[PDB]
Amino acid sequence: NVNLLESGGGLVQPGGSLNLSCAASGFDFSRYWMSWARQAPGKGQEWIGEINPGSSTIKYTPSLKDKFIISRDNAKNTLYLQMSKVSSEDTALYYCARYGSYVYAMDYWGPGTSVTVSSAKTTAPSVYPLAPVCGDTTGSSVTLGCLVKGYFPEPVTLTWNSGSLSSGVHTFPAVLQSDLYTLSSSVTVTSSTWPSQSITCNVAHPASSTKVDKKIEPRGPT
Amino acid sequence: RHVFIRTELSFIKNNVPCIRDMFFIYKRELYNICLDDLDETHIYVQKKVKDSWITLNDLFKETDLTGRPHIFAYVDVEEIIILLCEDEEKDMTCHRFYSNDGKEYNNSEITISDYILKDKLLSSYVSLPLKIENREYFLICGVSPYKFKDDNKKDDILCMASHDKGETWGTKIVIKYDNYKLGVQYFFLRPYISKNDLSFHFYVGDNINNVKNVNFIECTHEKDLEFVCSNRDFLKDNKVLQDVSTLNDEYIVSYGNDNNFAECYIFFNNENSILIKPEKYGNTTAGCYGGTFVKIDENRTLFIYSSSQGIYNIHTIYYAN
Amino acid sequence: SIVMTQTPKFLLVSAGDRITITCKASQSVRNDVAWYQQKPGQSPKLLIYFASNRYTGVPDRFTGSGSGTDFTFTISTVQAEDLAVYFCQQGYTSPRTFGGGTKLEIKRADAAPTVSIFPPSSEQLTSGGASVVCFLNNFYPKDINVKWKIDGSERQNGVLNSWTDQDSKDSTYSMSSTLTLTKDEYERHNSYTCEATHKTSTSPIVKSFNRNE
Ligand SMILES: *[C@@H]1O[C@H](CO[C@@H]2O[C@@H](C)[C@@H](O)[C@@H](O)[C@@H]2O)[C@@H](O[C@@H]2O[C@H](CO)[C@@H](O)[C@H](O)[C@H]2NC(C)=O)[C@H](O)[C@H]1NC(C)=O
């Protein structure tokens, strides 16, 4: 069962350098061509490059030929992308992908990992739990919120009860505001489940080693 | 004395302007081994479906090859086997593929050191196994381009051969073609094979691009691995020889009205005759210059020729009784 | 570098309907074209290769065709799971450029938004800013408009809205809208109201709270 994983993403100042790795498993890594592609926010996929198992054949998009250089270690089952002299155009979510047998098509993509290029520095989110209205009117259901505010840069991960809560979640795309992102999430459960059972939003910001949990409890005395 | 003839015509579109075509039959279906080159080159395995070629695989992407290679296809009732061998730019390196469905080929690579054909020219072709005393053989055959001088019969047509599918090419196969001319030079030699019968098809003349005359030579055993081959005539007045095939142990022989190939004749046992006139509806002249037989069985055979764009005219020819 | 022009861009259709996107290349690219789907939140998945071949595990509804310059991708009976971004790619030569993509979203029966209003968190007022949040979950069709009332007056600035993609589960959209202000600006006013307007009802959906409740 094929599996890929990207690593090394994050912020980098313009004109700088960054290394990106992709570990692969479940298949013969030395038996298949490998490739890099990327997704600028709000834009279509852009092919980056490709390399044959013996590393004899490496090919790039003309714009990136003197910037990036692709490589691979068959002994470590790992694909590598070396980036340098980046500009604002390169801020993108990077995917590493395998070619199919006898086809120049990406038959399996990895999740990818983020890369942001900006002169602004890292910032950890505030996390504010959103309990319902203080004069709550119980219905068949209750809805709880979680407000992530003022972090930079992307991405950020948010789950409920460490992913124990699945249906009824609505996690909105982050909105930018003067170099500071903001995100929010909603969840809806039966009135018999809350506040009878604990409900927490878990928030993680890799960019500054931030990990916060926030338990939702009704407004009132404590 | 019965004769039954029937002629059908079907057209096929191909989006690939193949530099060179290589049809073969597997199951009932038709396949082509296309070559596209003009930096990157492709060797497509296309398959006839309804009205158009459908590419299935790019074998050449497995590569580790440098440039344009010789191609040797071998078709059995069980499985297709395709070899991509480097031509001289010193012992042969090839890529072996095999499939028992025609869709999913398996990859491999082989090297024949000190190979028998070390100083011979080769050209790509499709072929069938040659039965020999309960041992079928695939043959890679090479012809010496042109002989300047000393009379010698050793390796005018040499073949190296394998009886383990394509995996190893140990056996030598000697051909004694008792013919020579000074400025004559052979090209595009391929082995026509039918049951135990070995034959060769090749062009004769001074060096390539001015080839004109076709030559065909039947072969008969001298040893288990040695053949003697004498030329078989096919000349007809005001007609140029083109291609040769067999139906029901009889020859079917195509010709053209002349080298411009405005029309093609099919000749059954040099007794019955058919005329294929290509209808023209383009500014380009229509002709059958590339026309080749593709045997289906002992009763049916195809006659194929391309035109202006990738328009494969395909005559389905039936002849029996 | 070859260019791949994809038509159309947005497709809104009901289930059980056929669809056919087309892809036109700047030059001949033989038969080497692939078609991919990425559902929202998902990495792209291969679906078609060499223009007209199924990839293994690809459901029959997906088909591809076309010759030379131009190609077509087709779904026979679109389903709610097929809400996605589809795009073509040329494999004939490097660079192996992609197309511009084609979003595909589905029709469904219209639904009234479920609205909830949330006053600023107890932890947040320490930081000197107050964030009033309003959620409007599970509603069709696409468009909805929210107005913010502060003691009966419409408020211009400070709103920040965000929409989810269509949900594959229920073909429903979701929306959040948040107004942040100075905690002193929160401190001088009492009632706050999230108001919503949508085709499902002539009357706006209203949810509200006062500062001390
Ligand atoms: C990014 O990585 C390069 C190379 O690291 C090596 O190549 C990788 C594929 C990986 O397998 C590593 O284990 C290898 O050791 C770094 O470039 C090297 O840097 C050192 C000093 O930094 C220098 O002596 C080497 O010559 C460099 N090699 C090359 C090929 O340039 C680079 O420093 C890394 N940068 C970051 C930010 O991690």
Side-chain angles (χ1 to χ4, degrees):
Chain A
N1 306 314
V2 177
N3 222 318
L4 305 176
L5 184 53
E6 289 78 352
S7 305
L11 176 61
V12 51
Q13 310 195 7
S17 159
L18 186 65
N19 282 346
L20 295 185
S21 57
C22 203
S25 52
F27 69 99
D28 203 325
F29 174 83
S30 310
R31 215 72 166 83
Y32 289 79
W33 285 52
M34 226 49 62
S35 81
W36 288 102
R38 65 179 185 174
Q39 238 217 214
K43 292 190 61 178
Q45 304 280 352
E46 191 179 28
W47 187 79
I48 302 179
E50 62 190 18
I51 180 172
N52 78 320
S55 311
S56 59
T57 307
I58 311 172
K59 297 187 177 184
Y60 308 84
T61 299
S63 41
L64 304 163
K65 172 187 170 184
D66 295 276
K67 311 175 67 172
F68 305 166
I69 32 186
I70 308 177
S71 52
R72 55 188 294 171
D73 198 335
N74 301 331
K76 292 183 179 179
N77 301 336
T78 310
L79 185 70
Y80 300 111
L81 177 56
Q82 297 191 30
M83 314 164 58
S84 63
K85 64 195 67 173
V86 300
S87 98
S88 62
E89 309 166 338
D90 306 286
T91 300
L93 166 66
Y94 282 71
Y95 303 98
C96 112
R98 183 191 76 178
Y99 282 180
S101 313
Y102 312 109
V103 308
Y104 282 108
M106 340 259 275
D107 76 329
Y108 192 86
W109 302 58
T113 205
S114 175
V115 170
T116 300
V117 180
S118 180
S119 307
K121 268 73 174 185
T122 315
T123 305
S126 282
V127 189
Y128 306 127
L130 291 178
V133 74
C134 160
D136 231 26
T137 295
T138 296
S140 60
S141 67
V142 293
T143 302
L144 316 180
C146 197
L147 181 64
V148 186
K149 182 186 178 71
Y151 63 96
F152 186 82
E154 292 280 37
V156 139
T157 59
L158 185 155
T159 57
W160 291 88
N161 303 5
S162 185
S164 135
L165 200 31
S166 313
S167 60
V169 182
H170 291 296
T171 301
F172 308 91
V175 188
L176 188 47
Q177 178 192 7
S178 50
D179 289 343
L180 279 182
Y181 288 111
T182 297
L183 183 132
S184 63
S185 178
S186 78
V187 61
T188 296
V189 297
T190 315
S191 46
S192 53
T193 309
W194 186 92
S196 64
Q197 188 180 294
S198 67
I199 286 188
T200 304
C201 46
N202 315 85
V203 173
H205 191 212
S208 209
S209 306
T210 307
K211 222 306 187 304
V212 192
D213 288 21
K214 284 296 175 176
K215 187 175 177 179
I216 313 281
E217 298 202 352
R219 308 182 185 270
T222 27
Chain B
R1 284 168 157 265
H2 254 301
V3 177
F4 189 110
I5 304 181
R6 185 220 294 176
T7 296
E8 310 171 8
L9 179 50
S10 316
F11 304 91
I12 301 197
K13 323 150 185 169
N14 189 26
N15 335 289
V16 192
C18 301
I19 306 306
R20 147 201 272 96
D21 288 314
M22 255 176 297
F23 319 111
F24 68 92
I25 298 304
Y26 181 83
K27 303 174 178 177
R28 334 290 181 89
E29 286 118 306
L30 212 173
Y31 300 83
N32 179 23
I33 305 176
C34 174
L35 202 190
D36 193 9
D37 174 25
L38 299 173
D39 302 333
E40 84 297 317
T41 70
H42 304 289
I43 295 189
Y44 295 143
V45 172
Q46 297 173 340
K47 175 178 189 167
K48 172 193 195 303
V49 177
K50 295 181 178 185
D51 206 18
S52 51
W53 294 107
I54 296 190
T55 309
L56 307 182
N57 287 308
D58 185 323
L59 315 174
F60 186 81
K61 179 232 271 66
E62 313 321 284
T63 329
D64 218 334
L65 250 36
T66 65
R68 196 176 300 185
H70 292 148
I71 307 174
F72 298 120
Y74 304 103
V75 193
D76 202 354
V77 194
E78 304 168 334
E79 56 180 308
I80 311 156
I81 294 185
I82 291 178
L83 274 76
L84 298 189
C85 300
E86 287 179 343
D87 71 331
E88 282 199 330
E89 294 183 331
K90 267 186 175 180
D91 30 329
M92 270 247 298
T93 287
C94 303
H95 295 272
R96 184 177 181 270
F97 301 80
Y98 58 103
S99 174
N100 20 27
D101 46 38
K103 317 141 190 174
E104 293 302 317
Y105 297 83
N106 285 278
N107 193 342
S108 192
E109 174 179 323
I110 57 172
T111 294
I112 25 205
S113 309
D114 305 39
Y115 71 111
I116 312 174
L117 311 177
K118 170 156 183 161
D119 287 331
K120 308 293 181 186
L121 293 204
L122 323 160
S123 63
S124 328
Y125 57 81
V126 183
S127 183
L128 315 177
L130 178 57
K131 181 179 187 176
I132 293 182
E133 256 245 289
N134 272 285
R135 256 211 202 174
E136 294 183 337
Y137 290 93
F138 303 153
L139 318 189
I140 293 179
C141 294
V143 51
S144 320
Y146 124 91
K147 183 119 70 171
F148 195 2
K149 192 204 172 172
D150 226 342
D151 308 334
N152 185 240
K153 308 177 178 180
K154 189 190 179 85
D155 307 314
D156 306 319
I157 312 173
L158 186 50
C159 304
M160 71 180 170
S162 52
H163 60 89
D164 51 16
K165 311 282 186 171
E167 286 146 354
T168 71
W169 297 80
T171 83
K172 182 182 300 185
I173 289 193
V174 178
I175 284 82
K176 299 295 184 183
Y177 181 39
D178 192 30
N179 256 115
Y180 10 68
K181 286 177 183 172
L182 296 176
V184 83
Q185 156 161 287
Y186 308 165
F187 311 89
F188 306 127
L189 177 117
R190 65 174 190 242
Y192 184 75
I193 298 179
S194 70
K195 310 253 64 53
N196 324 337
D197 303 326
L198 216 197
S199 312
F200 288 94
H201 178 281
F202 55 99
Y203 285 77
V204 296
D206 62 335
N207 300 47
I208 355 190
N209 226 128
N210 197 2
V211 315
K212 302 249 177 184
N213 305 320
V214 176
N215 275 36
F216 183 88
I217 53 174
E218 303 180 292
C219 297
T220 52
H221 276 264
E222 286 281 296
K223 293 188 187 179
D224 284 272
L225 301 178
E226 201 203 289
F227 295 90
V228 147
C229 312
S230 207
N231 195 285
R232 171 68 186 265
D233 177 24
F234 283 116
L235 289 162
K236 281 178 120 68
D237 311 323
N238 304 319
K239 295 180 245 292
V240 283
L241 180 55
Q242 187 182 56
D243 192 12
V244 183
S245 190
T246 55
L247 291 172
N248 201 15
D249 288 26
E250 288 173 348
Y251 281 115
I252 52 175
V253 186
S254 57
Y255 303 92
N257 51 262
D258 215 79
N259 292 323
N260 285 122
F261 284 103
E263 310 165 344
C264 280
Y265 314 82
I266 317 300
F267 273 89
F268 307 89
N269 208 35
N270 284 280
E271 291 173 321
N272 303 84
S273 111
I274 256 74
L275 177 67
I276 298 164
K277 175 121 160 183
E279 41 89 70
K280 48 175 183 175
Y281 215 74
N283 160 41
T284 328
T285 42
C288 49
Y289 165 79
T292 31
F293 292 111
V294 192
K295 190 172 179 176
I296 306 179
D297 55 11
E298 236 49 54
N299 295 334
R300 298 158 260 271
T301 186
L302 306 156
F303 184 77
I304 296 184
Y305 62 89
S306 62
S307 287
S308 59
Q309 182 198 352
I311 316 176
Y312 291 76
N313 292 22
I314 294 196
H315 302 262
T316 313
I317 298 178
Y318 182 88
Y319 164 84
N321 292 331
Chain C
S1 177
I2 308 187
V3 182
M4 306 291 284
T5 292
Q6 223 186 329
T7 327
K9 242 208 62 179
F10 200 131
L11 224 66
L12 235 182
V13 84
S14 205
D17 306 335
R18 291 232 202 167
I19 58 106
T20 300
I21 159 88
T22 42
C23 194
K24 228 212 182 189
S26 43
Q27 297 173 357
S28 180
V29 291
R30 312 293 186 262
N31 229 127
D32 309 29
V33 161
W35 290 92
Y36 308 87
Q37 156 216 227
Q38 67 165 20
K39 308 178 183 182
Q42 270 191 342
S43 287
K45 163 182 164 57
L46 184 54
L47 280 178
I48 298 293
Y49 64 93
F50 276 145
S52 51
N53 292 269
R54 334 273 218 160
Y55 204 72
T56 158
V58 168
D60 313 274
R61 330 153 199 159
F62 302 92
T63 50
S65 166
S67 173
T69 341
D70 53 346
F71 306 88
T72 91
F73 180 89
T74 290
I75 304 178
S76 54
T77 296
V78 176
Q79 297 180 356
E81 59 153 308
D82 293 335
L83 140 85
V85 171
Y86 298 79
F87 40 86
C88 42
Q89 176 204 28
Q90 72 97 3
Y92 172 69
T93 187
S94 303
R96 315 186 188 279
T97 57
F98 291 92
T102 297
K103 183 76 173 182
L104 182 71
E105 300 185 330
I106 313 301
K107 283 190 220 170
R108 67 145 282 171
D110 310 343
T114 309
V115 183
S116 297
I117 186 172
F118 297 133
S121 183
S122 339
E123 315 176 20
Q124 183 185 13
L125 283 92
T126 295
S127 60
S131 303
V132 187
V133 176
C134 176
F135 288 140
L136 309 94
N137 291 350
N138 307 100
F139 62 92
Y140 192 76
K142 270 146 33 192
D143 195 29
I144 184 179
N145 200 331
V146 174
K147 294 172 179 174
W148 275 103
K149 146 175 148 62
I150 298 184
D151 283 334
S153 289
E154 183 177 353
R155 176 51 93 92
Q156 289 172 309
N157 297 3
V159 188
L160 273 191
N161 25 349
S162 204
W163 295 267
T164 63
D165 266 327
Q166 194 186 40
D167 202 346
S168 149
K169 196 177 183 182
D170 298 320
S171 311
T172 50
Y173 301 76
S174 299
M175 169 180 181
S176 167
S177 199
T178 297
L179 206 168
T180 67
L181 3 78
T182 315
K183 191 197 56 195
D184 295 28
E185 281 174 350
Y186 176 87
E187 217 73 2
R188 218 163 310 181
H189 305 98
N190 190 245
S191 67
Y192 300 92
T193 283
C194 190
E195 217 180 80
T197 29
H198 195 62
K199 69 164 295 186
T200 52
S201 82
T202 52
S203 189
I205 295 186
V206 178
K207 287 300 175 61
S208 177
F209 87 106
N210 56 40
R211 165 144 58 98
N212 183 25
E213 190 178 4

